[PDB]
Write a protein that binds this ligand. Sequence first.
Ligand SMILES: *C[C@@](*)(O)[C@H](CCCNC(N)=[NH2+])NC(=O)[C@@H]1CCCN1C(=O)[C@H](N)Cc1ccccc1
Ligand SMILES: [Ca+2]
Lengths: 51, 235
Amino acid sequence: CNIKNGRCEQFCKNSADNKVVCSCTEGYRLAENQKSCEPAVPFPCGRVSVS
Amino acid sequence: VVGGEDAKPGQFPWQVVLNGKVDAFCGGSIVNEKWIVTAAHCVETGVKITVVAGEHNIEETEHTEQKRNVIRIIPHHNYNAAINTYNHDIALLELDEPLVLNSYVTPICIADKEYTNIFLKFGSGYVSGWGRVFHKGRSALVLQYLRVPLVDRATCLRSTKFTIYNNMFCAGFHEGGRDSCQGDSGGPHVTEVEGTSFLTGIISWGEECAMKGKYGIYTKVSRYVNWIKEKTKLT
Ligand SMILES: *C[C@@](*)(O)[C@H](CCCNC(N)=[NH2+])NC(=O)[C@@H]1CCCN1C(=O)[C@H](N)Cc1ccccc1
Ligand SMILES: [Ca+2]
């Protein structure tokens, strides 16, 4: 997780063989690429959607 | 907020204003549809408070405002254990009826303790509110916001005769001119992480506003996230 958060968009945890496991906050789900976080509800926290 | 700029509608959709025996006396942030986090010094009395989410201009109607009554107030249990220290300046407000989430009414994200501190230490956060726009001056009509730099602990200690506890941080500019201010207390200090905003502080206290050599003092939210999550559970 050492450099650039393990490429996790939100949260990183270290795992054996020096791999990482990414995760996301409530309202998001870990995307297919196992790094990015995508919305899982209509108005997830912390996002500007009026724009 | 002194030296800030007008927000656009929906730019800080977690921001709320508190109204009571004074209009627009403090801010807060949406934790979820039933719960607001604010400063304990905003709500010491138990007197009646209302919350307005989806607010932008407090003298106009936007048709985005959602007004709620506060039915429960939970100051942190260690607030006012010592007199006039402003330690543990954080409180939670339960709403009578759930907010309806939409583009103007959206929660702020709250990470675990480790990552809230990581986000703070990135070192640049946004504060917002309808507080004073000059020291001893009038309150804002349009929601204000300001980017403030994190200030090193040693510098902050030297800036004031007060104690800066571990549960606090300092933010602002070495030359002054830009700061949160009276009326902004309880509103968010937030850190944007790849387009997603996380709560990193609560606007708490200072000495006057925007004076050179002084900094805004903020409650360090990382130390309180377990308590926030415990108390604001929905079921
Ligand atoms: C309740 C909040 O609106 C307000 C926020 C002020 C933030 N100031 C800056 N410069 N960012 N907080 C307060 O009013 C708190 C709680 C009550 C006292 N207080 C103060 O900020 C006082 N100014 C602290 C103080 C300073 C000098 C002498 C006596 C008290
Ligand atoms: Ca309005």
